[PDB]
Amino acid sequence: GAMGDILIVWAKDVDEMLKQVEILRRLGAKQIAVESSDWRILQEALKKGGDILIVNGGGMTITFRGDDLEALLKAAIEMIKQALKFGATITLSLDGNDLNINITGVPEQVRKELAKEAERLAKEFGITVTRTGGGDVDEMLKQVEILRRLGAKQIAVHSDDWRILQEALK
Amino acid sequence: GAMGDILIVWAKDVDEMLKQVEILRRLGAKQIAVESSDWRILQEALKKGGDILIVNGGGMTITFRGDDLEALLKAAIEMIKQALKFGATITLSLDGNDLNINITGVPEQVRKELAKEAERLAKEFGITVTRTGGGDVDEMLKQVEILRRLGAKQIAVHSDDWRILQEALK
Ligand SMILES: [Cl-]
Ligand SMILES: [Cu+2]
Ligand SMILES: [Cu+2]
């Protein structure tokens, strides 16, 4: 189309992903890339006729959930300050009663510290937290091969994520 | 490669972009996509042999600059709270004495309010701010055609950005 060739959907939920893909198809979108740290969401994207995927190998998505948005933001702000100081790239969105934080470009030890801090902050502000991705390099290699077997034609990785993984491989 | 086909570089500076592309090429990367709200950075990415670009049509990159990181973070935190409340997707990184904020998925009026607030916060915390992108839909259509003329093969748009632009077109 006149504005570009590919639309990028950041998918945090399988049903929201399918709803978004459908809305874009009705608006005349022809190629939809799906980005998610959840391997099942990426597998579902392929099943629905997508073939461009953005994967998260060494990073993770932290999802804070709760009815008080100001509590979600206080928890998120602490994660943001720490993640940025460690040299992370962070993507944030509000999704209903959820605040989603994608974190890339930090080594395994730092990822572990940020995961622990997410748990601590969740308790402190009386909210819940779920973590997706941040598996080892071996699991990433396996899941990428599975996406390829299921018909992925183009797999993209954030360069900071890829650099950390290549250092972990060495 | 074993981890994927494409690496995504978020480029905020033309020299940093070229340095990153070179580091990845030396690590054995074969396809590098460049994402930036700066049309000249994307043109430079093509000149260096790239052909995959991620553009920002209706959104913008806000860059806070200053020697006190705690001042940069206070300004960024206010932008984050407001942007998220407006339904924005936000990407953040630290780059030397710079804090970069990519904002997508808000209409023109909201973008204008966030730009004004960035200026106000910069003054309040004794730091500087620069804005990139957030031009009208006509300028986006023109610059995408120019990228295509200069040899872009795949142009990607964030789905939230694209939805806002299609609403602006209508
Ligand atoms: Cl992306
Ligand atoms: Cu991303
Ligand atoms: Cu992006």
PDB file of N, CA and C in Angstrom, chain B residues 4-94:
ATOM      1  N   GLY B   4      17.166 -16.395  13.428  1.00  0.00           N
ATOM      2  CA  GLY B   4      16.234 -15.612  12.591  1.00  0.00           C
ATOM      3  C   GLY B   4      16.873 -15.120  11.304  1.00  0.00           C
ATOM      4  N   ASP B   5      16.112 -14.352  10.517  1.00  0.00           N
ATOM      5  CA  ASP B   5      16.471 -13.919   9.141  1.00  0.00           C
ATOM      6  C   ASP B   5      16.857 -12.437   9.124  1.00  0.00           C
ATOM      7  N   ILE B   6      16.279 -11.632  10.021  1.00  0.00           N
ATOM      8  CA  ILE B   6      16.370 -10.141  10.010  1.00  0.00           C
ATOM      9  C   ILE B   6      16.676  -9.657  11.430  1.00  0.00           C
ATOM     10  N   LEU B   7      17.604  -8.708  11.570  1.00  0.00           N
ATOM     11  CA  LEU B   7      17.866  -7.968  12.835  1.00  0.00           C
ATOM     12  C   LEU B   7      17.263  -6.564  12.718  1.00  0.00           C
ATOM     13  N   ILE B   8      16.537  -6.119  13.747  1.00  0.00           N
ATOM     14  CA  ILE B   8      15.932  -4.757  13.795  1.00  0.00           C
ATOM     15  C   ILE B   8      16.858  -3.841  14.602  1.00  0.00           C
ATOM     16  N   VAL B   9      17.379  -2.797  13.954  1.00  0.00           N
ATOM     17  CA  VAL B   9      18.149  -1.698  14.598  1.00  0.00           C
ATOM     18  C   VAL B   9      17.227  -0.484  14.714  1.00  0.00           C
ATOM     19  N   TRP B  10      16.935  -0.051  15.944  1.00  0.00           N
ATOM     20  CA  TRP B  10      16.300   1.263  16.220  1.00  0.00           C
ATOM     21  C   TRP B  10      17.395   2.329  16.165  1.00  0.00           C
ATOM     22  N   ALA B  11      17.336   3.196  15.154  1.00  0.00           N
ATOM     23  CA  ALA B  11      18.350   4.231  14.860  1.00  0.00           C
ATOM     24  C   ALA B  11      17.813   5.597  15.297  1.00  0.00           C
ATOM     25  N   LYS B  12      18.511   6.237  16.239  1.00  0.00           N
ATOM     26  CA  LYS B  12      18.189   7.590  16.761  1.00  0.00           C
ATOM     27  C   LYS B  12      19.229   8.597  16.254  1.00  0.00           C
ATOM     28  N   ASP B  13      20.371   8.111  15.756  1.00  0.00           N
ATOM     29  CA  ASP B  13      21.513   8.939  15.283  1.00  0.00           C
ATOM     30  C   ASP B  13      22.153   8.233  14.081  1.00  0.00           C
ATOM     31  N   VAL B  14      22.504   8.987  13.037  1.00  0.00           N
ATOM     32  CA  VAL B  14      23.012   8.432  11.745  1.00  0.00           C
ATOM     33  C   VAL B  14      24.351   7.716  11.985  1.00  0.00           C
ATOM     34  N   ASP B  15      25.246   8.288  12.794  1.00  0.00           N
ATOM     35  CA  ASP B  15      26.593   7.710  13.059  1.00  0.00           C
ATOM     36  C   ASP B  15      26.464   6.455  13.930  1.00  0.00           C
ATOM     37  N   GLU B  16      25.587   6.477  14.935  1.00  0.00           N
ATOM     38  CA  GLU B  16      25.358   5.314  15.834  1.00  0.00           C
ATOM     39  C   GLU B  16      24.766   4.166  15.007  1.00  0.00           C
ATOM     40  N   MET B  17      23.827   4.478  14.108  1.00  0.00           N
ATOM     41  CA  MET B  17      23.184   3.506  13.182  1.00  0.00           C
ATOM     42  C   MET B  17      24.266   2.783  12.367  1.00  0.00           C
ATOM     43  N   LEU B  18      25.172   3.540  11.740  1.00  0.00           N
ATOM     44  CA  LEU B  18      26.253   3.011  10.859  1.00  0.00           C
ATOM     45  C   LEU B  18      27.210   2.139  11.678  1.00  0.00           C
ATOM     46  N   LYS B  19      27.559   2.581  12.890  1.00  0.00           N
ATOM     47  CA  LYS B  19      28.422   1.831  13.842  1.00  0.00           C
ATOM     48  C   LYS B  19      27.750   0.501  14.217  1.00  0.00           C
ATOM     49  N   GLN B  20      26.448   0.518  14.519  1.00  0.00           N
ATOM     50  CA  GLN B  20      25.683  -0.694  14.921  1.00  0.00           C
ATOM     51  C   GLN B  20      25.614  -1.674  13.747  1.00  0.00           C
ATOM     52  N   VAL B  21      25.248  -1.188  12.559  1.00  0.00           N
ATOM     53  CA  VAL B  21      25.149  -2.016  11.319  1.00  0.00           C
ATOM     54  C   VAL B  21      26.492  -2.721  11.091  1.00  0.00           C
ATOM     55  N   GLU B  22      27.605  -2.007  11.284  1.00  0.00           N
ATOM     56  CA  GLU B  22      28.982  -2.532  11.066  1.00  0.00           C
ATOM     57  C   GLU B  22      29.289  -3.626  12.099  1.00  0.00           C
ATOM     58  N   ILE B  23      28.970  -3.393  13.380  1.00  0.00           N
ATOM     59  CA  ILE B  23      29.188  -4.370  14.492  1.00  0.00           C
ATOM     60  C   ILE B  23      28.416  -5.661  14.191  1.00  0.00           C
ATOM     61  N   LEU B  24      27.180  -5.547  13.705  1.00  0.00           N
ATOM     62  CA  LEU B  24      26.309  -6.717  13.426  1.00  0.00           C
ATOM     63  C   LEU B  24      26.856  -7.475  12.210  1.00  0.00           C
ATOM     64  N   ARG B  25      27.287  -6.756  11.170  1.00  0.00           N
ATOM     65  CA  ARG B  25      27.886  -7.360   9.948  1.00  0.00           C
ATOM     66  C   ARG B  25      29.128  -8.170  10.341  1.00  0.00           C
ATOM     67  N   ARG B  26      29.962  -7.654  11.254  1.00  0.00           N
ATOM     68  CA  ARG B  26      31.193  -8.345  11.739  1.00  0.00           C
ATOM     69  C   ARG B  26      30.816  -9.593  12.557  1.00  0.00           C
ATOM     70  N   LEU B  27      29.639  -9.610  13.188  1.00  0.00           N
ATOM     71  CA  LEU B  27      29.137 -10.773  13.975  1.00  0.00           C
ATOM     72  C   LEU B  27      28.438 -11.784  13.053  1.00  0.00           C
ATOM     73  N   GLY B  28      28.296 -11.471  11.759  1.00  0.00           N
ATOM     74  CA  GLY B  28      27.803 -12.399  10.720  1.00  0.00           C
ATOM     75  C   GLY B  28      26.344 -12.172  10.345  1.00  0.00           C
ATOM     76  N   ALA B  29      25.745 -11.042  10.732  1.00  0.00           N
ATOM     77  CA  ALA B  29      24.362 -10.662  10.350  1.00  0.00           C
ATOM     78  C   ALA B  29      24.308 -10.391   8.841  1.00  0.00           C
ATOM     79  N   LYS B  30      23.257 -10.864   8.160  1.00  0.00           N
ATOM     80  CA  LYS B  30      23.112 -10.817   6.677  1.00  0.00           C
ATOM     81  C   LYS B  30      22.019  -9.825   6.255  1.00  0.00           C
ATOM     82  N   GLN B  31      20.937  -9.696   7.033  1.00  0.00           N
ATOM     83  CA  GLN B  31      19.826  -8.747   6.750  1.00  0.00           C
ATOM     84  C   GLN B  31      19.567  -7.892   7.990  1.00  0.00           C
ATOM     85  N   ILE B  32      19.697  -6.574   7.844  1.00  0.00           N
ATOM     86  CA  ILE B  32      19.500  -5.587   8.943  1.00  0.00           C
ATOM     87  C   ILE B  32      18.410  -4.605   8.507  1.00  0.00           C
ATOM     88  N   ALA B  33      17.287  -4.616   9.225  1.00  0.00           N
ATOM     89  CA  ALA B  33      16.181  -3.645   9.108  1.00  0.00           C
ATOM     90  C   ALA B  33      16.488  -2.451  10.015  1.00  0.00           C
ATOM     91  N   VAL B  34      16.214  -1.233   9.541  1.00  0.00           N
ATOM     92  CA  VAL B  34      16.465  -0.009  10.359  1.00  0.00           C
ATOM     93  C   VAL B  34      15.131   0.692  10.635  1.00  0.00           C
ATOM     94  N   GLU B  35      14.869   1.016  11.905  1.00  0.00           N
ATOM     95  CA  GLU B  35      13.621   1.715  12.312  1.00  0.00           C
ATOM     96  C   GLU B  35      13.996   3.101  12.844  1.00  0.00           C
ATOM     97  N   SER B  36      13.353   4.152  12.322  1.00  0.00           N
ATOM     98  CA  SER B  36      13.641   5.545  12.757  1.00  0.00           C
ATOM     99  C   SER B  36      12.524   6.490  12.303  1.00  0.00           C
ATOM    100  N   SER B  37      12.276   7.547  13.082  1.00  0.00           N
ATOM    101  CA  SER B  37      11.268   8.577  12.725  1.00  0.00           C
ATOM    102  C   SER B  37      11.968   9.634  11.867  1.00  0.00           C
ATOM    103  N   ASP B  38      13.287   9.482  11.715  1.00  0.00           N
ATOM    104  CA  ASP B  38      14.144  10.420  10.942  1.00  0.00           C
ATOM    105  C   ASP B  38      14.307   9.880   9.517  1.00  0.00           C
ATOM    106  N   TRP B  39      13.747  10.577   8.525  1.00  0.00           N
ATOM    107  CA  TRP B  39      13.734  10.130   7.107  1.00  0.00           C
ATOM    108  C   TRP B  39      15.165  10.067   6.559  1.00  0.00           C
ATOM    109  N   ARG B  40      16.050  10.970   6.994  1.00  0.00           N
ATOM    110  CA  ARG B  40      17.465  11.006   6.535  1.00  0.00           C
ATOM    111  C   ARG B  40      18.206   9.760   7.044  1.00  0.00           C
ATOM    112  N   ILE B  41      17.924   9.307   8.269  1.00  0.00           N
ATOM    113  CA  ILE B  41      18.555   8.082   8.846  1.00  0.00           C
ATOM    114  C   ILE B  41      18.132   6.874   7.999  1.00  0.00           C
ATOM    115  N   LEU B  42      16.859   6.801   7.609  1.00  0.00           N
ATOM    116  CA  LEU B  42      16.331   5.687   6.776  1.00  0.00           C
ATOM    117  C   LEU B  42      16.960   5.743   5.379  1.00  0.00           C
ATOM    118  N   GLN B  43      17.148   6.944   4.818  1.00  0.00           N
ATOM    119  CA  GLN B  43      17.789   7.133   3.491  1.00  0.00           C
ATOM    120  C   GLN B  43      19.239   6.634   3.567  1.00  0.00           C
ATOM    121  N   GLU B  44      19.933   6.927   4.669  1.00  0.00           N
ATOM    122  CA  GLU B  44      21.342   6.506   4.896  1.00  0.00           C
ATOM    123  C   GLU B  44      21.403   4.978   5.016  1.00  0.00           C
ATOM    124  N   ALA B  45      20.433   4.364   5.697  1.00  0.00           N
ATOM    125  CA  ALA B  45      20.312   2.893   5.838  1.00  0.00           C
ATOM    126  C   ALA B  45      20.261   2.240   4.449  1.00  0.00           C
ATOM    127  N   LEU B  46      19.506   2.824   3.509  1.00  0.00           N
ATOM    128  CA  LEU B  46      19.396   2.328   2.107  1.00  0.00           C
ATOM    129  C   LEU B  46      20.742   2.486   1.388  1.00  0.00           C
ATOM    130  N   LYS B  47      21.389   3.646   1.539  1.00  0.00           N
ATOM    131  CA  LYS B  47      22.691   3.978   0.899  1.00  0.00           C
ATOM    132  C   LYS B  47      23.758   2.950   1.307  1.00  0.00           C
ATOM    133  N   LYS B  48      23.672   2.402   2.525  1.00  0.00           N
ATOM    134  CA  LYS B  48      24.662   1.441   3.085  1.00  0.00           C
ATOM    135  C   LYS B  48      24.330  -0.005   2.692  1.00  0.00           C
ATOM    136  N   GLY B  49      23.241  -0.236   1.954  1.00  0.00           N
ATOM    137  CA  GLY B  49      22.921  -1.553   1.364  1.00  0.00           C
ATOM    138  C   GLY B  49      21.732  -2.239   2.022  1.00  0.00           C
ATOM    139  N   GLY B  50      21.101  -1.617   3.023  1.00  0.00           N
ATOM    140  CA  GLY B  50      19.835  -2.109   3.606  1.00  0.00           C
ATOM    141  C   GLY B  50      18.684  -1.947   2.623  1.00  0.00           C
ATOM    142  N   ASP B  51      17.617  -2.744   2.754  1.00  0.00           N
ATOM    143  CA  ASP B  51      16.385  -2.585   1.930  1.00  0.00           C
ATOM    144  C   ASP B  51      15.111  -2.830   2.758  1.00  0.00           C
ATOM    145  N   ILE B  52      15.225  -3.112   4.063  1.00  0.00           N
ATOM    146  CA  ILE B  52      14.060  -3.252   4.990  1.00  0.00           C
ATOM    147  C   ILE B  52      14.072  -2.076   5.973  1.00  0.00           C
ATOM    148  N   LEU B  53      12.970  -1.323   6.035  1.00  0.00           N
ATOM    149  CA  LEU B  53      12.861  -0.089   6.856  1.00  0.00           C
ATOM    150  C   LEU B  53      11.558  -0.127   7.653  1.00  0.00           C
ATOM    151  N   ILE B  54      11.604   0.355   8.891  1.00  0.00           N
ATOM    152  CA  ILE B  54      10.401   0.562   9.742  1.00  0.00           C
ATOM    153  C   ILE B  54      10.230   2.071   9.928  1.00  0.00           C
ATOM    154  N   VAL B  55       9.116   2.608   9.439  1.00  0.00           N
ATOM    155  CA  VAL B  55       8.847   4.074   9.390  1.00  0.00           C
ATOM    156  C   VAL B  55       7.870   4.431  10.516  1.00  0.00           C
ATOM    157  N   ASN B  56       7.864   5.705  10.914  1.00  0.00           N
ATOM    158  CA  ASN B  56       6.933   6.287  11.917  1.00  0.00           C
ATOM    159  C   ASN B  56       6.207   7.450  11.241  1.00  0.00           C
ATOM    160  N   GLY B  57       4.939   7.250  10.873  1.00  0.00           N
ATOM    161  CA  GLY B  57       4.151   8.225  10.098  1.00  0.00           C
ATOM    162  C   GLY B  57       3.524   9.291  10.976  1.00  0.00           C
ATOM    163  N   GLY B  58       2.628   8.887  11.879  1.00  0.00           N
ATOM    164  CA  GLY B  58       1.804   9.792  12.705  1.00  0.00           C
ATOM    165  C   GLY B  58       2.379  10.006  14.094  1.00  0.00           C
ATOM    166  N   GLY B  59       3.392   9.223  14.478  1.00  0.00           N
ATOM    167  CA  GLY B  59       4.002   9.269  15.819  1.00  0.00           C
ATOM    168  C   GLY B  59       5.201  10.194  15.838  1.00  0.00           C
ATOM    169  N   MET B  60       6.036  10.092  16.871  1.00  0.00           N
ATOM    170  CA  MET B  60       7.267  10.913  16.991  1.00  0.00           C
ATOM    171  C   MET B  60       8.250  10.259  17.964  1.00  0.00           C
ATOM    172  N   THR B  61       9.527  10.612  17.826  1.00  0.00           N
ATOM    173  CA  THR B  61      10.592  10.330  18.818  1.00  0.00           C
ATOM    174  C   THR B  61      10.873  11.626  19.579  1.00  0.00           C
ATOM    175  N   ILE B  62      10.720  11.592  20.905  1.00  0.00           N
ATOM    176  CA  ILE B  62      11.145  12.675  21.839  1.00  0.00           C
ATOM    177  C   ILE B  62      12.490  12.261  22.438  1.00  0.00           C
ATOM    178  N   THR B  63      13.491  13.138  22.354  1.00  0.00           N
ATOM    179  CA  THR B  63      14.851  12.897  22.901  1.00  0.00           C
ATOM    180  C   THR B  63      15.166  13.973  23.941  1.00  0.00           C
ATOM    181  N   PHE B  64      15.181  13.585  25.216  1.00  0.00           N
ATOM    182  CA  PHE B  64      15.663  14.415  26.349  1.00  0.00           C
ATOM    183  C   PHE B  64      17.185  14.268  26.423  1.00  0.00           C
ATOM    184  N   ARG B  65      17.902  15.375  26.644  1.00  0.00           N
ATOM    185  CA  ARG B  65      19.389  15.415  26.717  1.00  0.00           C
ATOM    186  C   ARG B  65      19.809  16.213  27.957  1.00  0.00           C
ATOM    187  N   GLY B  66      20.844  15.747  28.662  1.00  0.00           N
ATOM    188  CA  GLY B  66      21.343  16.369  29.905  1.00  0.00           C
ATOM    189  C   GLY B  66      22.272  15.443  30.670  1.00  0.00           C
ATOM    190  N   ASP B  67      23.061  16.009  31.589  1.00  0.00           N
ATOM    191  CA  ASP B  67      24.157  15.318  32.321  1.00  0.00           C
ATOM    192  C   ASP B  67      23.601  14.591  33.553  1.00  0.00           C
ATOM    193  N   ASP B  68      22.479  15.061  34.107  1.00  0.00           N
ATOM    194  CA  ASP B  68      21.795  14.426  35.265  1.00  0.00           C
ATOM    195  C   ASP B  68      20.764  13.422  34.735  1.00  0.00           C
ATOM    196  N   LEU B  69      21.061  12.121  34.838  1.00  0.00           N
ATOM    197  CA  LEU B  69      20.168  11.022  34.381  1.00  0.00           C
ATOM    198  C   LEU B  69      18.850  11.063  35.164  1.00  0.00           C
ATOM    199  N   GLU B  70      18.890  11.423  36.451  1.00  0.00           N
ATOM    200  CA  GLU B  70      17.689  11.449  37.329  1.00  0.00           C
ATOM    201  C   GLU B  70      16.716  12.526  36.829  1.00  0.00           C
ATOM    202  N   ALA B  71      17.227  13.616  36.244  1.00  0.00           N
ATOM    203  CA  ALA B  71      16.416  14.695  35.632  1.00  0.00           C
ATOM    204  C   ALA B  71      15.766  14.177  34.341  1.00  0.00           C
ATOM    205  N   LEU B  72      16.531  13.462  33.507  1.00  0.00           N
ATOM    206  CA  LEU B  72      16.022  12.821  32.262  1.00  0.00           C
ATOM    207  C   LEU B  72      14.871  11.874  32.615  1.00  0.00           C
ATOM    208  N   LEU B  73      15.034  11.065  33.668  1.00  0.00           N
ATOM    209  CA  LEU B  73      14.050  10.022  34.071  1.00  0.00           C
ATOM    210  C   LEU B  73      12.763  10.678  34.594  1.00  0.00           C
ATOM    211  N   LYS B  74      12.867  11.753  35.380  1.00  0.00           N
ATOM    212  CA  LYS B  74      11.683  12.481  35.919  1.00  0.00           C
ATOM    213  C   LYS B  74      10.837  13.012  34.753  1.00  0.00           C
ATOM    214  N   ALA B  75      11.474  13.628  33.753  1.00  0.00           N
ATOM    215  CA  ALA B  75      10.809  14.153  32.538  1.00  0.00           C
ATOM    216  C   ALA B  75      10.161  12.992  31.769  1.00  0.00           C
ATOM    217  N   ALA B  76      10.916  11.910  31.540  1.00  0.00           N
ATOM    218  CA  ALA B  76      10.474  10.709  30.790  1.00  0.00           C
ATOM    219  C   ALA B  76       9.262  10.068  31.477  1.00  0.00           C
ATOM    220  N   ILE B  77       9.298   9.943  32.808  1.00  0.00           N
ATOM    221  CA  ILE B  77       8.217   9.303  33.619  1.00  0.00           C
ATOM    222  C   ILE B  77       6.890  10.046  33.388  1.00  0.00           C
ATOM    223  N   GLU B  78       6.899  11.381  33.343  1.00  0.00           N
ATOM    224  CA  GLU B  78       5.672  12.199  33.126  1.00  0.00           C
ATOM    225  C   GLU B  78       5.133  11.945  31.714  1.00  0.00           C
ATOM    226  N   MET B  79       6.014  11.938  30.708  1.00  0.00           N
ATOM    227  CA  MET B  79       5.680  11.623  29.292  1.00  0.00           C
ATOM    228  C   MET B  79       5.080  10.213  29.200  1.00  0.00           C
ATOM    229  N   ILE B  80       5.656   9.249  29.925  1.00  0.00           N
ATOM    230  CA  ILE B  80       5.218   7.819  29.924  1.00  0.00           C
ATOM    231  C   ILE B  80       3.793   7.734  30.490  1.00  0.00           C
ATOM    232  N   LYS B  81       3.543   8.337  31.657  1.00  0.00           N
ATOM    233  CA  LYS B  81       2.213   8.286  32.320  1.00  0.00           C
ATOM    234  C   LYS B  81       1.153   8.850  31.365  1.00  0.00           C
ATOM    235  N   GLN B  82       1.413  10.011  30.759  1.00  0.00           N
ATOM    236  CA  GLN B  82       0.455  10.705  29.857  1.00  0.00           C
ATOM    237  C   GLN B  82       0.243   9.882  28.584  1.00  0.00           C
ATOM    238  N   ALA B  83       1.330   9.492  27.912  1.00  0.00           N
ATOM    239  CA  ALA B  83       1.302   8.755  26.628  1.00  0.00           C
ATOM    240  C   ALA B  83       0.495   7.462  26.793  1.00  0.00           C
ATOM    241  N   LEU B  84       0.778   6.673  27.835  1.00  0.00           N
ATOM    242  CA  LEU B  84       0.061   5.400  28.130  1.00  0.00           C
ATOM    243  C   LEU B  84      -1.437   5.674  28.341  1.00  0.00           C
ATOM    244  N   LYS B  85      -1.781   6.714  29.104  1.00  0.00           N
ATOM    245  CA  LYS B  85      -3.195   7.068  29.409  1.00  0.00           C
ATOM    246  C   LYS B  85      -3.939   7.384  28.102  1.00  0.00           C
ATOM    247  N   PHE B  86      -3.258   7.987  27.121  1.00  0.00           N
ATOM    248  CA  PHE B  86      -3.834   8.366  25.802  1.00  0.00           C
ATOM    249  C   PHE B  86      -3.939   7.150  24.866  1.00  0.00           C
ATOM    250  N   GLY B  87      -3.407   5.985  25.260  1.00  0.00           N
ATOM    251  CA  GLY B  87      -3.477   4.727  24.487  1.00  0.00           C
ATOM    252  C   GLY B  87      -2.263   4.527  23.589  1.00  0.00           C
ATOM    253  N   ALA B  88      -1.162   5.236  23.856  1.00  0.00           N
ATOM    254  CA  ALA B  88       0.086   5.165  23.062  1.00  0.00           C
ATOM    255  C   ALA B  88       0.824   3.853  23.347  1.00  0.00           C
ATOM    256  N   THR B  89       1.573   3.370  22.358  1.00  0.00           N
ATOM    257  CA  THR B  89       2.686   2.407  22.546  1.00  0.00           C
ATOM    258  C   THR B  89       3.982   3.220  22.584  1.00  0.00           C
ATOM    259  N   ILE B  90       4.842   2.959  23.567  1.00  0.00           N
ATOM    260  CA  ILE B  90       6.076   3.755  23.827  1.00  0.00           C
ATOM    261  C   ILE B  90       7.280   2.815  23.847  1.00  0.00           C
ATOM    262  N   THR B  91       8.356   3.192  23.160  1.00  0.00           N
ATOM    263  CA  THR B  91       9.675   2.507  23.211  1.00  0.00           C
ATOM    264  C   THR B  91      10.695   3.492  23.791  1.00  0.00           C
ATOM    265  N   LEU B  92      11.472   3.048  24.783  1.00  0.00           N
ATOM    266  CA  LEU B  92      12.456   3.878  25.528  1.00  0.00           C
ATOM    267  C   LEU B  92      13.839   3.225  25.471  1.00  0.00           C
ATOM    268  N   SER B  93      14.887   4.049  25.408  1.00  0.00           N
ATOM    269  CA  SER B  93      16.300   3.632  25.580  1.00  0.00           C
ATOM    270  C   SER B  93      17.122   4.812  26.106  1.00  0.00           C
ATOM    271  N   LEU B  94      18.212   4.515  26.814  1.00  0.00           N
ATOM    272  CA  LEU B  94      19.290   5.481  27.146  1.00  0.00           C
ATOM    273  C   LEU B  94      20.370   5.360  26.071  1.00  0.00           C
TER     274      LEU B  94
END
